[PDB]
Design an enzyme around this catalytic site. Structure first.
Site, mmCIF file in Angstrom:
data_model
loop_
_atom_site.group_PDB
_atom_site.id
_atom_site.type_symbol
_atom_site.label_atom_id
_atom_site.label_comp_id
_atom_site.label_asym_id
_atom_site.label_seq_id
_atom_site.Cartn_x
_atom_site.Cartn_y
_atom_site.Cartn_z
ATOM 1 N N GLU A 177 -25.886 27.260 56.420
ATOM 2 C CA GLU A 177 -25.828 28.673 56.082
ATOM 3 C C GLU A 177 -27.109 29.068 55.338
ATOM 4 O O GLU A 177 -27.805 28.222 54.770
ATOM 5 C CB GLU A 177 -24.664 28.973 55.134
ATOM 6 N N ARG A 192 -14.776 34.092 70.216
ATOM 7 C CA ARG A 192 -16.219 33.932 70.428
ATOM 8 C C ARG A 192 -16.501 33.120 71.711
ATOM 9 O O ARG A 192 -15.916 32.038 71.887
ATOM 10 C CB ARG A 192 -16.840 33.222 69.221
ATOM 11 N N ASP A 248 -23.713 22.684 64.397
ATOM 12 C CA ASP A 248 -23.386 23.270 63.119
ATOM 13 C C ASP A 248 -24.671 23.381 62.281
ATOM 14 O O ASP A 248 -25.356 22.400 62.022
ATOM 15 C CB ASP A 248 -22.314 22.463 62.395
ATOM 16 N N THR A 249 -25.068 24.611 62.010
ATOM 17 C CA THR A 249 -26.322 24.943 61.361
ATOM 18 C C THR A 249 -26.030 25.305 59.914
ATOM 19 O O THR A 249 -25.008 25.928 59.626
ATOM 20 C CB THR A 249 -26.960 26.115 62.115
ATOM 21 N N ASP A 275 -24.838 30.424 63.603
ATOM 22 C CA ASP A 275 -24.594 29.841 64.904
ATOM 23 C C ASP A 275 -24.106 30.898 65.894
ATOM 24 O O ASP A 275 -23.764 30.544 67.022
ATOM 25 C CB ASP A 275 -23.618 28.685 64.769
ATOM 26 N N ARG A 309 -20.852 31.827 70.168
ATOM 27 C CA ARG A 309 -20.975 30.765 69.154
ATOM 28 C C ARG A 309 -21.546 29.508 69.833
ATOM 29 O O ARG A 309 -20.854 28.931 70.680
ATOM 30 C CB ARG A 309 -19.583 30.492 68.557
HETATM 31 C C1 LIG Z 1 -18.441 25.476 67.817
HETATM 32 C C2 LIG Z 1 -16.934 25.630 67.830
HETATM 33 C C3 LIG Z 1 -16.265 26.080 66.761
HETATM 34 N N1 LIG Z 1 -14.887 26.238 66.716
HETATM 35 C C4 LIG Z 1 -14.228 26.723 65.502
HETATM 36 C C5 LIG Z 1 -13.933 25.616 64.500
HETATM 37 C C6 LIG Z 1 -14.022 26.311 63.175
HETATM 38 O O1 LIG Z 1 -12.709 26.835 62.987
HETATM 39 P P1 LIG Z 1 -12.155 26.604 61.488
HETATM 40 O O2 LIG Z 1 -13.107 27.329 60.548
HETATM 41 O O3 LIG Z 1 -10.806 27.328 61.562
HETATM 42 O O4 LIG Z 1 -12.076 25.212 61.120
HETATM 43 C C7 LIG Z 1 -15.042 27.425 63.424
HETATM 44 C C8 LIG Z 1 -16.426 27.119 62.937
HETATM 45 O O5 LIG Z 1 -17.289 28.210 63.390
HETATM 46 P P2 LIG Z 1 -18.472 28.713 62.442
HETATM 47 O O6 LIG Z 1 -19.345 27.536 62.114
HETATM 48 O O7 LIG Z 1 -19.127 29.752 63.258
HETATM 49 O O8 LIG Z 1 -17.767 29.284 61.288
HETATM 50 O O9 LIG Z 1 -15.071 27.673 64.836
HETATM 51 C C9 LIG Z 1 -14.110 25.890 67.801
HETATM 52 O O10 LIG Z 1 -12.888 26.059 67.776
HETATM 53 N N2 LIG Z 1 -14.792 25.420 68.900
HETATM 54 C C10 LIG Z 1 -16.161 25.242 69.011
HETATM 55 O O11 LIG Z 1 -16.628 24.759 70.046
#
Ligand SMILES: Cc1cn([C@H]2C[C@H](OP(=O)(O)O)[C@@H](COP(=O)(O)O)O2)c(=O)[nH]c1=O
Ligand SMILES: Cc1cn([C@H]2C[C@H](OP(=O)(O)O)[C@@H](COP(=O)(O)O)O2)c(=O)[nH]c1=O
Ligand SMILES: [Ca+2]
Lengths: 132, 139
Positions: free
Chosen positions: A38, A76, A35-36, A16, A30
């Protein structure tokens, strides 16, 4: 004789996340609202190939920040990513290669657009939604 | 208010004759020694591009090899021979008529004859670049 030294290829696209040049500097983005899977999950390779083709073949990439939070807790840039006018976030979900996720007030402008695409992918039982 | 779209560009690991690699713990752009590949807006550019991307993206082991003269060009690119699982990319493109031998300078020309030889052979088979009529007429 000359000497061979190790090196490893840089990856701009990782699930993502995508690394783009913005305001003349590199920045990690990001994708909002999705949520895609892995690479080691079902549909993960398919979602990576779709993203790669969409973004590498674009003449024009644009990013659209939302209004609520510009950067997540991990540094991000949170955005909708457009490839020649078409939203990558939406296209993935439409193709059943990503789910709608991480939907929060302030950063949820295109939520209905995405829920519409997802409904269509589920109705078609496409890709992620083909499983029992 | 509507959200606004802003420009950005994809960061490209492979772009023309350049490849971005992690080298001694830091990212570095490398320019392939001794070759000139068509750019993606020129003929065979998307092919030479795909052949490079195939070779390098599918490699389990990538190596760089600096020569004895200039290490870095005036655009800040490391000048190297690039290897993918032991096969030199520079040489391969030239052998497959997807690049021309070029920019050959004393000191950074250890592999000049290997490549010139590949270029000599590439014309005779007439593949890709050399598949055009009079493409070997030095124009
Ligand atoms: C898409 C997105 C993810 N996130 C956070 C939540 C997740 O944190 P936690 O892992 O601490 O729960 C993580 C998931 O990203 P990835 O799917 O890139 O790993 O990024 C946000 O805080 N806001 C957003 O809009
Ligand atoms: C291959 C190579 C290129 N270069 C320079 C020559 C060209 O500069 P000019 O653009 O000033 O003509 C440029 C071509 O790179 P690209 O072919 O990657 O654009 O890189 C060197 O200086 N040394 C080399 O060994
Ligand atoms: Ca070139």
């Amino acid at each position: 004789k000359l000497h061979k030294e190790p090196a490893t290829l840089i990856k701009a696209i990782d699930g993502d996340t995508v690394k783009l040049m913005y305001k003349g500097q590199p920045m990690t983005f990001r994708r909002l609202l999705v949520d895609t899977p892995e690479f080691n999950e079902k549909y993960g390779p398919e979602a990576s190939a779709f993203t790669k083709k969409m973004v590498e073949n674009a003449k024009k990439i644009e990013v659209e920040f939302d209004k609520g939070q510009r950067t997540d807790k991990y540094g991000r840039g949170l955005a909708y990513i457009y490839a020649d006018g078409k939203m990558v976030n939406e296209a993935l979900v439409r193709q059943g290669l990503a789910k709608v996720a991480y939907v929060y007030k302030g950063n949820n402008t295109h939520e209905q657009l995405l829920r519409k695409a997802e409904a269509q992918a589920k109705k078609e039982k496409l890709n992620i939604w083909s499983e029992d």
